[PDB]
Amino acid sequence: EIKELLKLGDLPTSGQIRLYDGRTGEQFERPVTVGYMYMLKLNHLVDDKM
Amino acid sequence: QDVVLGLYYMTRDCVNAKGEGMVLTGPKEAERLYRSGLASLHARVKVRIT
Amino acid sequence: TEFLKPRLVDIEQVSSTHAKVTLEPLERGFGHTLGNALRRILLSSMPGCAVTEVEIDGVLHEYSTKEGVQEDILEILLNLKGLAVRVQGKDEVILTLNKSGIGPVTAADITHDGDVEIVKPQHVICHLTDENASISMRIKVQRGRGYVPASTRIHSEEDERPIGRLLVDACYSPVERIAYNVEAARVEQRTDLDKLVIEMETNGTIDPEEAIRRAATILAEQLEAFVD
Amino acid sequence: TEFLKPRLVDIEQVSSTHAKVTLEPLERGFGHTLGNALRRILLSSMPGCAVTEVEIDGVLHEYSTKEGVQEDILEILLNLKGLAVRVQGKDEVILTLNKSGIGPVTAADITHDGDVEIVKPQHVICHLTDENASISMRIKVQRGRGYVPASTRIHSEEDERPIGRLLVDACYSPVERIAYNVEAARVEQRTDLDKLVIEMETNGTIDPEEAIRRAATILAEQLEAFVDLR
Amino acid sequence: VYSYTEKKRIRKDFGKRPQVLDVPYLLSIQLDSFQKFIEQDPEGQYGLE
Amino acid sequence: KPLVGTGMERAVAVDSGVTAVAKRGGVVQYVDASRIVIKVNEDEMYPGEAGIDIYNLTKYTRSNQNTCINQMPCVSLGEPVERGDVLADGPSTDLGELAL
Amino acid sequence: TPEEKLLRAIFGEKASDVKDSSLRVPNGVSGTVIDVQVFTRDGVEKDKRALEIEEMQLKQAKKDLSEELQILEAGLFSRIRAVLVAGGVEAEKLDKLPRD
Amino acid sequence: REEAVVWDILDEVIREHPVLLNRAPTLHRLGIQAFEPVLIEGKAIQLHPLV
RNA sequence: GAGUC
């Protein structure tokens, strides 16, 4: 069902794309896994822990 | 981890690829070729090395 | 709007072939911008001169072994790709090697020729073992750009070569190795900006420093359109 | 041996934000070299105009609440940083937002000053509920390159501002999304010619052409150093 | 067939089975126990009583 | 809003009770970033008291861990809501949903 | 110490018998003072700061409960208007005439 | 008052001064090791991957 | 109460 959605998004079925290194402009020799992920910042602050 | 990965990647040998059976006079030339993208690191090759 | 202007500092010539140059200070991330763009052109756009073909009489193909010569045809081929030459005005030049007997055949034994300058007199080419071993040939040197293998010329060539015309991979680029390290430079108070340390190896004839100037120059010429 | 001179050729403008530009003729290798250098410089070193400072009357600090007002203080701050500005001759100016009564405030409601132009007049700022509710504010907008937050001004703060004045983080770089594509270019005979294809989206501010040219220029100046001293 | 908040944000359910009865108000345990302490119920011998 | 959820994010939000939920539903009379006042459906309205439900929102107070406690109103003025509609969100909450 | 005795005399700033006990911002942290609360003692007389902030509380209390009453009142009167409008069509001289 | 000359001199004292890094648990002797420390702004310490 | 292995 997931791959089916990827088709509907007009994306790669493995969710991998060929990317360019922003430093060099050299392409990565293999297409890489990207995508949106839900992230969180923890209560642990280097601010206080210093 | 990463160090291993990079090293393994370079050492590994692949079928033909870009420029199988080329001839190099020393290492530095290798690098030039790779950086121009007309030679993959995986290609089996003949080099003069001291 | 505040651009940064950097200036030249360190310039250690570890040898004539190899020079390390350290440069401060560069605005953030421009270390990489400049580092890479320079590298690319350095190697792969660099016009030069050098060996394209060879004709040895009695050596009509590149795989056989003539008695007396230690090395194979094939091996000596590649040695000679590396040998460095100075031309003046001329586009297409044929140098002659005649040599006999015992010894390593060196660059000096080539015919001097007016406009031509031989850079590395000491470069070993082949070893002739017994004195009865003799070699004669004509080595063709052209002007071109960068590096072109035999395979790319054979691509669109209606020019059919003759008996034992021996094409070799052409290494025009005198630039041998080039790389950049970017350590965060930290000018008094602003930490963010970075150092560009640049290691460069070249093929003798042209001095490392002069390489630099020429690279940036070519760059600039293209830039003409877009400054004004 | 004849080196090529690449010119500015095609200059399409799709949306007020978007613009395409092709640069032929290019030789091999330079497509990518220039492609990357361009991008870097474009984003970090593009001078842009953004909101620097703000005073809204009867509001001391960002966290409290004023009646009549849909958004929070912080959220309206956020709206305003993003708003697209074209200043003429002067480096720093203060625009006035004065609006009363029922309805939503667009940038349009900002009373318009001569030299200043609002690129996106229809930008949502704040919604006005109660009829007798109205607001007055003075918003300062400055020129600058890259990203300078408010916290770095408190960093070297000799400008100890009176309380009530609220300094804003500045998203100065107007370039929102930027890329290049090295494609083969149509010379009627020449095969070995490529074009650099410049895909670009910005917050209106800097005009496509103008942007690029200024980019190239500032780049070039750095190039002077290396070439001249040996 | 959904309320206004859901109309505003409907998430696409892939769930292949129907939850029959509803997810019970999770923080009920606390209230129910504490409420028992004060529960005015003559016969129910709990809490005060 | 979490793009990849389990649907459970709506229930989590609702139960935490840090949001404001509509007691009666009806139409929103006044919206403030501080007060949300709601006029009840005549259907549901008690003949005892007036049909006016009041939600003063809690804004920007100190949590135990030094965290911030900020409620944001979700609906707009003059809008329709029913019983149990999400009216104002707690800090880590989007329209109905848990937004960690 | 004897040294400090002489020095006091020399610069001539005697400095009264007091210690600096003031509350300072801990280092590393820095930000915005959003609100301040004070708790005076019952016995000792109030500070001007004390009064002005407790006066603020008065104003706030007043405004809040005043507008509570006002909006509730308007809704209740508007509800009575729905029953008088059934068996008694009159919209021109009710509204323009007084409320209570 | 954190003047920039302060930092210049600090750096000079810190030059060739090796400092010690420790992690719990201190299992064997290499739980503590010496490095030449180099100043970075920011509040986290940077370690070499190899160790 | 939570971090590390």
PDB file of C-alpha atoms in Angstrom, chain D residues 56-59 64-73 76 126-135, chain F residues 29-37 56, chain G residues 59-60 63-64 66-68 70-71:
ATOM      1  CA  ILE D  56       3.739  48.439  18.848  1.00  0.00           C
ATOM      2  CA  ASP D  57       2.205  50.889  21.279  1.00  0.00           C
ATOM      3  CA  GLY D  58       0.929  49.710  24.635  1.00  0.00           C
ATOM      4  CA  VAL D  59       2.899  46.498  24.213  1.00  0.00           C
ATOM      5  CA  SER D  64       1.642  39.107  26.781  1.00  0.00           C
ATOM      6  CA  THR D  65      -1.746  39.632  25.145  1.00  0.00           C
ATOM      7  CA  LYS D  66      -3.570  42.678  23.727  1.00  0.00           C
ATOM      8  CA  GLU D  67      -7.342  42.570  23.428  1.00  0.00           C
ATOM      9  CA  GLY D  68      -8.971  42.760  20.001  1.00  0.00           C
ATOM     10  CA  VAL D  69      -5.999  40.908  18.429  1.00  0.00           C
ATOM     11  CA  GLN D  70      -6.318  37.475  16.736  1.00  0.00           C
ATOM     12  CA  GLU D  71      -2.675  36.415  16.724  1.00  0.00           C
ATOM     13  CA  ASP D  72      -0.233  36.423  19.601  1.00  0.00           C
ATOM     14  CA  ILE D  73       2.542  38.891  19.653  1.00  0.00           C
ATOM     15  CA  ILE D  76       2.555  38.447  14.329  1.00  0.00           C
ATOM     16  CA  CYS D 126      -3.313  40.302  11.591  1.00  0.00           C
ATOM     17  CA  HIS D 127      -7.064  40.028  11.922  1.00  0.00           C
ATOM     18  CA  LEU D 128      -9.064  42.744  13.625  1.00  0.00           C
ATOM     19  CA  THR D 129     -12.101  41.544  15.605  1.00  0.00           C
ATOM     20  CA  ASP D 130     -13.831  44.180  17.742  1.00  0.00           C
ATOM     21  CA  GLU D 131     -14.872  47.375  15.890  1.00  0.00           C
ATOM     22  CA  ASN D 132     -13.302  49.816  18.348  1.00  0.00           C
ATOM     23  CA  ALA D 133     -10.086  47.823  18.210  1.00  0.00           C
ATOM     24  CA  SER D 134      -7.382  49.401  16.157  1.00  0.00           C
ATOM     25  CA  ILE D 135      -3.641  49.274  15.972  1.00  0.00           C
TER      26      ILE D 135
ATOM     27  CA  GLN F  29     -19.453  34.780  19.487  1.00  0.00           C
ATOM     28  CA  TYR F  30     -16.061  36.117  20.469  1.00  0.00           C
ATOM     29  CA  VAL F  31     -12.527  35.034  19.735  1.00  0.00           C
ATOM     30  CA  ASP F  32      -9.551  36.426  21.505  1.00  0.00           C
ATOM     31  CA  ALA F  33      -6.080  35.056  22.020  1.00  0.00           C
ATOM     32  CA  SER F  34      -7.176  34.969  25.648  1.00  0.00           C
ATOM     33  CA  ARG F  35     -10.955  34.298  25.687  1.00  0.00           C
ATOM     34  CA  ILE F  36     -13.299  32.219  23.546  1.00  0.00           C
ATOM     35  CA  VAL F  37     -16.960  32.834  23.989  1.00  0.00           C
ATOM     36  CA  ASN F  56     -10.711  31.941  29.373  1.00  0.00           C
TER      37      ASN F  56
ATOM     38  CA  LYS G  59      -7.980  46.684  37.491  1.00  0.00           C
ATOM     39  CA  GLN G  60      -7.615  43.207  35.993  1.00  0.00           C
ATOM     40  CA  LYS G  63     -12.248  44.320  33.972  1.00  0.00           C
ATOM     41  CA  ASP G  64     -12.483  40.537  33.842  1.00  0.00           C
ATOM     42  CA  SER G  66     -17.132  43.245  34.577  1.00  0.00           C
ATOM     43  CA  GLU G  67     -16.963  41.989  31.051  1.00  0.00           C
ATOM     44  CA  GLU G  68     -18.087  38.510  32.339  1.00  0.00           C
ATOM     45  CA  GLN G  70     -21.724  42.303  30.594  1.00  0.00           C
ATOM     46  CA  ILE G  71     -21.546  39.515  27.995  1.00  0.00           C
TER      47      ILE G  71
END
